Amino acid sequence: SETAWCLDGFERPTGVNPVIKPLPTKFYCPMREDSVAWEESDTFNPAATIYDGKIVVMYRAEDNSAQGIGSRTSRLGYATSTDGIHFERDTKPAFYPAKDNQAENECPGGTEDPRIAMTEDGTYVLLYTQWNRKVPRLAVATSKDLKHWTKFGPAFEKAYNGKFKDEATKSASLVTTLKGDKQVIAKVNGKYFMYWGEKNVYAATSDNLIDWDPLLDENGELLKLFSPRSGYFDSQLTECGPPAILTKDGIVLLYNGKNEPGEKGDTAYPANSYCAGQALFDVNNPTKLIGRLDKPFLQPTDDFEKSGQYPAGTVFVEGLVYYRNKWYLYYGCADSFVAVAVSDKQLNF
Numbered sequence: 001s002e003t004a005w006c007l008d009g010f011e012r013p014t015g016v017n018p019v020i021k022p023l024p025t026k027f028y029c030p031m032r033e034d035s036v037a038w039e040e041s042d043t044f045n046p047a048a049t050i051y052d053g054k055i056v057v058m059y060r061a062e063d064n065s066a067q068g069i070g071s072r073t074s075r076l077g078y079a080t081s082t083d084g085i086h087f088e089r090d091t092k093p094a095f096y097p098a099k100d101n102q103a104e105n106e107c108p109g110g111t112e113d114p115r116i117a118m119t120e121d122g123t124y125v126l127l128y129t130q131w132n133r134k135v136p137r138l139a140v141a142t143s144k145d146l147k148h149w150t151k152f153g154p155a156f157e158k159a160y161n162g163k164f165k166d167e168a169t170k171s172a173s174l175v176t177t178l179k180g181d182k183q184v185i186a187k188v189n190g191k192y193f194m195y196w197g198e199k200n201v202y203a204a205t206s207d208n209l210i211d212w213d214p215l216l217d218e219n220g221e222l223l224k225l226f227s228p229r230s231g232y233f234d235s236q237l238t239e240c241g242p243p244a245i246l247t248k249d250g251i252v253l254l255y256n257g258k259n260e261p262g263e264k265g266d267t268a269y270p271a272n273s274y275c276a277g278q279a280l281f282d283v284n285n286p287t288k289l290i291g292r293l294d295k296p297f298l299q300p301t302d303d304f305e306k307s308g309q310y311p312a313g314t315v316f317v318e319g320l321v322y323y324r325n326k327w328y329l330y331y332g333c334a335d336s337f338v339a340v341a342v343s344d345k346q347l348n349f
């Protein structure tokens with residue numbers, strides 16, 4: 001099969017979704033200095049990882065402090081599961097804006113759209129968006145326990161004398177691999193590597209997981225590994241999803257395509273909807289694109305995927321774990337809920 005390399009075979013378990021919905025839970029916010037209903041409006045765009053024998057989903061939670069996409073405060077919840085479907089949720093968010101070293105970048109919009117991957121020595125590396133209602137910035141935090149976090153600030157703060165420190169950035173997929181059943185961050189040609197971006201798929205390297213250097217073209221502009229394309233589901237945006245997976249057949253990148261309305265999109269899919277795709281890069285040259293799905297492997301199907309805070313619908317893939325011999329894929333549903341799909345497919349390592 002020409003698509004044998006992809007991680008497909010996903011199925012929504014019958015009747016279980018969504019697995020995380022909003023709740024009226026309160027916590028004392030150090031940014032507001034006030035008790036806030038931190039997950040009252042929408043719970044979506046989740047990171048996922050494995051810690052202490054369980055699946056952990058860290059979901060993007062929004063309060064009702066305003067109406068409109070990007071108008072409120074995002075904080076990350078902490079939910080655990082032993083079956084991938086039923087979650088036990090903390091009442092206090094595990095990650096949030098505060099009067100800390102990142103206050104200016106994260107106030108008042110908070111901390112959005114997390115992805116998590118883990119090093120071989122057990123360090124969780126969180127890539128997320130800082131939102132201060134001016135510029136979204138991709139930033140890095142680390143922890144050993146997913147609760148005691150150190151914030152290191154924007155991923156591109158230092159690179160090339162700060163060239164990109166005030167550019168709008170988000171949505172990063174670190175390269176990982178499986179060593180046996182254990183999913184860990186993997187160097188490519190001696191460097192840590194990630195795919196990142198929303199408007200195109202860009203990349204960056206690092207020696208230390210915190211300071212990242214975006215790949216550039218000959219003019220010193222961001223190198224576009226691939227881009228939105230006329231006539232396909234990913235015709236307006238190509239936005240990186242969960243961490244990438246280095247297999248024997250290439251580096252697999254799950255990503256989110258936004259469909260251009262009308263004839264320059266794929267009219268098989270709803271206008272403006274986000275449906276999930278996959279790309280494949282060469283293991284030795286990780287900027288060399290060697291595969292890309294013509295059609296999405298996941299699309300809005302249930303009513304809470306087809307419309308919500310985002311009216312045109314999303315299945316926004318962002319968390320992915322290998323647990324109890326299966327893949328559990330966590331995705332945002334129309335910027336409003338978290339859902340799971342499960343696959344038995346075994347990739348080649």
Ligand SMILES: [Mg+2]
Pocket residue numbers: 248348349
């Ligand atoms: Mg093999």
